Design a protein around this motif. Structure first.
Motif: not given
Ligand SMILES: [Zn+2]
Ligand SMILES: [Zn+2]
Lengths: 92, 90, 79, 105, 96, 81
Positions: C66-79
């Motif tokens: 959701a954050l990625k499609r909102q335009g603000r990627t978040l690192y540290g939880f996707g892997g």
DNA sequence: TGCCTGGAGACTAGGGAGTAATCCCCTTGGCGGTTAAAACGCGGGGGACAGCGCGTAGCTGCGTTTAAGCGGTGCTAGAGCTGTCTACGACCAATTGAGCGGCCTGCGCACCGGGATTCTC
DNA sequence: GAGAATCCCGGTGCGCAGGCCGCTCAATTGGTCGTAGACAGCTCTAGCACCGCTTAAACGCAGCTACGCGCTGTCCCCCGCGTTTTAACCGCCAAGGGGATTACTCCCTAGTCTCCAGGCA
């Protein structure tokens, strides 16, 4: 089984900083970063191939995607690294 | 004097500034409208808190810039409105 | 009314992290409204992702997408 | 950066010099008749009309003024462009710009 | 006869917001585009459609930037737009 | 081809501001706007030239500019694609 | 450490060069006018910016008050994985008609010209 | 009450949008056939709901003074308008060259399948 770039990131870190470790959260950050840039470059290569009506993603597509995405010095250094890797691969 | 010391203290730190339980309650209240009996992973709420705090800090920085442009030190709601209007989130 | 859970000192802490020296008294309501809007958007997208998966639990990956499609990627939880 | 005209510099110098004659910097702790200017204007004192208070004022010095740093007091080769204050080092310039350049904090 | 300052400015504001025509001369823009492009690669030919697309995009970008600049100028209680207004708009937009 | 940024004319910048709703314009706005347009054009044209060079072409088509603008986040309609 | 999975080893069909041809279309120095956007004065209004004085609203300090946080415990909804078997989508020949340019021509829209209304001073 | 700028109704001319005509190629129809995943069924994890202490943070008041804002007062700098510049832009006069497109051929080079051992979670 879950796949991740943690092992290769650790190998690169040991190559560049032999005595420096990395925490689990930092390793997760690195895995996410690698996945993000991989997906971005592949998506741009896909768009380049589709625009030019080409059914194959080749080194030219990846090189052009790298030039489009990465900023100047990073782009040129990455292009040099990729060309070197491909040249070594074809001659082996 | 104390304001600058507080700025430096929070600027050097990395911990989450919003309390975890109130934010979890707020997240669940917001999610209640979209779907009933929703369960949340702890990592999901932590991710929401990280994103929300980063968004708020970046917005406050833009509002501080807007306030400085008005020859003011205090930030006023009109600064937030202009920051969001120029950024395009309006 | 859990929006009051975002206490005034917490808003002050966030403003100080952003380098704000003085804060007006009406900033707190405005920032609560802004945070409510942002959370509403992100959580709506996350719940959409969760519903599409036939899951009843909003996982961290849903919030990341959701954050990625909102335009603000978040690192540290996707892997 | 902005630049202050001669009137502003002279006003700042006069204000600083007059502040050295103030009796106290704070207010009355109790918190609840003329002045020197009233005395001078009442005296109607004219220049060249024999020795008096105005004619007794010391004239300009022959030796030129020596510049000193507005921050630490040591001799200052440099002059601030914006306000004309003297300063001697990058650190002192930063302190002057943050504290007393333009707006008088 | 002489219109007081601001009236002709508002009149031309209304005129230029009624229309959709390009506001920059085509030949100077074509030369500017060719001058910028010759640095990246020599012997590059621009189609007329490409130059028109570039001009449309640039004019839209500048119009939106001027809207943000005017909003910055109304903020801080002003009417004139100054370079600080453009700088603030660009910085809030995320540029630079 | 040199010093073509002056082709962006003061009346042209004034007209663009008037379309943007500006009533009064400072004298230093023209240089700032020239610089901003120079930067924007540099980015878009660099991307477009990369797209044209990938196709092994020597002519920059409108489709290449549209793709460059879309990559920048400024998708433009009416010129194909 | 015990796997799955990436890596040799053989066919094989097609994607992507080469190679015409082929069609479209200006291309560029130096010249000469010639208008209409620029460029250049410049007088003056008004907006920008600098004080200055209030007075009220943020900030700091303190003593309560409160609930966030932490540690057990405990119970189950539900996420994750597996085995079956169908229903569904991928290919594949024959049809076939819907969607392409080619070509034309009403008609909508751009524009002009008086007269009237509206706006600014 | 003057002037100046739109606005509003006829007329009118032009070029392009909407339509008709062949033609073809890509949807459609009727088949086979792997296999993706929909659906039971199970398992065991972690999400939630309860406590009961610790104590750090939140809150309400008081005192204070720092700065936001309104009010004046220059003064400079930008606007409206007139006069002068010039640079878009058309015309010329020349001999053929690009430089992207569409058809043929054809040959490396990917994909697919089989087997295996070792890289990695
Ligand atoms: Zn010093
Ligand atoms: Zn100074």
């Amino acid at each position: 089984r879950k796949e991740s770039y943690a092992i290769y990131v650790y190998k690169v870190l040991k190559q560049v900083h032999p005595d420096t470790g990395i925490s689990s959260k930092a390793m997760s950050i690195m895995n996410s970063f690698v996945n993000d840039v991989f997906e971005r470059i592949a998506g741009e290569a896909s768009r380049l191939a589709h625009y030019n009506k080409r059914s194959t993603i080749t080194s030219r597509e990846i090189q052009t995607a790298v030039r489009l995405l990465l900023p100047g010095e990073l782009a040129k250094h990455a292009v040099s690294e990729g060309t070197k890797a491909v040249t070594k691969y074809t001659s082996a | 004097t104390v304001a600058l010391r507080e700025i430096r203290r929070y600027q050097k730190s990395t911990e989450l500034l919003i309390r975890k339980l109130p934010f979890q309650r707020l997240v669940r209240e917001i999610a209640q409208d979209f779907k009933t009996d929703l369960r949340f992973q702890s990592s999901a709420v932590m991710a929401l808190q990280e994103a929300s705090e980063a968004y708020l800090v970046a917005l406050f920085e833009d509002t501080n810039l807007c306030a400085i442009h008005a020859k003011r030190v205090t930030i006023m709601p009109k600064d937030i409105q202009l920051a969001r209007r120029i950024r395009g989130e309006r | 009314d859990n929006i009051q859970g975002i206490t005034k000192p917490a808003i002050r802490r966030l403003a100080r992290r952003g380098g704000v020296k003085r804060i007006s008294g009406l900033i707190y309501e405005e920032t609560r409204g802004v945070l409510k809007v942002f959370l509403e958007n992100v959580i709506r997208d996350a719940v959409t992702y969760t519903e599409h998966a036939k899951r009843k639990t909003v996982t961290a990956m849903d919030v990341v997408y959701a954050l990625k499609r909102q335009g603000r990627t978040l690192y540290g939880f996707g892997g | 950066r902005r630049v202050l005209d001669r009137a502003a510099r002279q006003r700042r110098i006069n204000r600083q010099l007059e502040a050295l004659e103030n009796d106290n910097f704070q207010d009355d702790p109790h918190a609840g008749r003329k002045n020197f200017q009233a005395l001078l204007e009442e005296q109607n004192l004219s220049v060249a009309e024999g020795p008096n208070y105005l004619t007794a004022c010391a004239g300009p010095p022959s030796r030129p003024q020596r510049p000193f740093c507005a921050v630490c007091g040591f001799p200052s080769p440099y002059t601030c462009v914006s306000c004309g204050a003297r300063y001697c080092t990058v650190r002192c310039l930063g302190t002057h710009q943050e504290t007393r350049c333009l707006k008088w904090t």
